[PDB]
Each structure stands twice: as structure tokens, then as C-alpha cells.
């Protein structure tokens, strides 16, 4: 069986009720990235930033937020491939886990974890953060998580699939190039062509809830 590496971004959770970065500004939930998504923003106004992520963490656990068909299809894909499958997500949500995927690499961290910053240790955390703990979230200027295992998988992949990601944020946006260098077949699945879509050998556009189960199903049937 082929080694398959899947990269996901915010687009795969859009239809699950988790709103995406509006590309038109530089705003996330009506906030500037510099203020809520940098270490400097956190130093400058810790209680606003803590409040921002407290809000994101709560919204994540609302009943109307659920895995969609795309999350489920990736769980089925892992079921079929075993250890020849690796899922890397830029998302801080837990929808891959709720869908049934395991060993999900959260290269940008997790909303349901916080970090004792003198510690390097991440701790499970589902409630608000009050009065110094920080969100276990990778901010701009900080090193993404799990990169060693990710780059090893990129060099070994027979198929690399990028789902729901716009190709603006590095190093994740560079994964498609790295995969191609080591001979992988590359696939982009997205609502619209990404900033790096031209690097991909194969591509399909439309809502993830439709496009991803469609691609996964035709991948699985091609196996047997």
C-alpha cells in the first residue's frame, strides 16, 4: 500500500462551524493577527489574548460543532492504511480526533491544551484560563511542533494530500514542494485554488464535505 501523508488546514473545519481567516483583511474573529497571534501580542496584553483563546476554546466545545463528512473520510482512510498513514494538521481544533483519527500531529498546537511557559510541558485544559499559563498554540515567529516526524514522513510519502489550506503560512505551505522532491504524487483538495496550488500534480475544488469523501473513496477503491 502507498504511504499517504495528509496535511489539513482551517478549510476542513469550516463546514463544522469553525469560521476561517477572512483573506480580505488580516483579521481573525475581528482581531488583528499581530495582537492575538504573536508572542509579542501576548506580552503586550496577556488578558485580552487569554480571553480571545478562552473564547475559541469554549466555541470549540459547543454542541453545534461537530466533525463533518471530510473529517470522517480521513478516519476511514487511516483505518484502511494503518501505519502507512500520517495526518498532520495546522488546526487547533479536535475534530480529527472526534472523527476517529489517532496520532494526529498538531504542528500548530491544540486549543484544548495549555502550556506552563517556564515548563515545556503541555497540559490538558478544557476550561477558561484565569490568573503564567499560555495557550498551547504556535504563534507567528515560533517553531511549529513535530517537524522532525513530519519531514521524515514527507520524504517517505507516495501520496501527499493538502486539504483546506491556503498556502500562505510556512513551513506548512512548503510541504508540497518537499513531497515532490522525494517523488510523492501531490494532491490539493480545497474550496478554491491555494497560493501554492500550481505545485500540485492533482487537484479538486469544492467544499471539503463533498470533495474529500469523493477523493478518499476513489483512493480506497483503487487499492483493492
Amino acid at each position: 500500500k502507498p504511504r499517504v501523508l495528509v496535511l489539513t488546514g482551517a478549510g476542513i473545519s469550516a463546514e463544522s462551524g469553525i469560521r476561517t481567516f477572512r483573506a480580505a483583511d488580516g483579521l481573525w474573529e475581528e482581531h488583528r493577527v499581530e495582537d492575538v497571534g504573536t508572542p509579542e501580542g501576548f506580552d503586550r496584553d496577556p488578558e485580552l489574548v487569554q480571553a480571545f483563546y478562552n473564547a475559541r476554546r469554549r466555541q470549540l466545545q459547543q454542541p453545534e460543532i461537530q466533525p463533518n463528512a471530510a473529517h470522517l473520510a480521513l478516519a476511514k482512510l487511516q483505518d484502511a492504511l494503518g501505519d502507512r498513514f500520517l495526518l498532520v494538521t495546522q488546526n487547533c481544533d479536535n475534530l480529527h480526533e472526534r472523527a476517529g483519527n489517532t496520532n494526529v500531529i498538531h504542528m500548530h498546537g491544540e486549543l484544548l491544551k495549555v502550556r506552563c511557559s517556564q515548563s515545556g510541558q503541555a497540559l490538558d485544559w478544557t476550561g477558561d484560563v484565569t490568573p503564567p499559563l499560555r495557550p498551547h498554540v504556535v504563534w507567528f515567529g515560533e517553531m511549529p511542533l513535530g517537524m522532525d516526524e513530519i519531514y521524515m514522513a514527507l520524504s517517505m510519502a507516495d501520496i501527499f494530500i493538502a486539504i483546506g489550506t491556503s498556502g500562505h503560512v510556512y513551513p506548512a505551505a512548503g510541504f508540497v514542494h518537499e513531497a515532490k522532491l522525494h517523488g510523492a504524487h501531490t494532491v490539493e483538495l480545497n474550496l478554491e485554488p491555494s497560493q501554492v496550488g500550481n505545485e500540485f500534480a492533482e487537484k479538486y475544488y469544492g467544499p471539503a464535505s463533498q470533495v474529500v469523501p469523493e477523493f478518499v473513496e476513489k483512493l480506497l477503491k483503487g487499492l483493492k
Partner: peptide, 9 residues
């Protein structure tokens, strides 16, 4: 690799 970074500076 490198740190998390956006396509515009």
C-alpha cells in the same frame, strides 16, 4: 522549515 511565518512581511 523555519518558524511559523506568513507569506507577507
Amino acid at each position: 522549515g523555519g518558524a511559523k511565518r506568513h507569506r507577507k512581511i
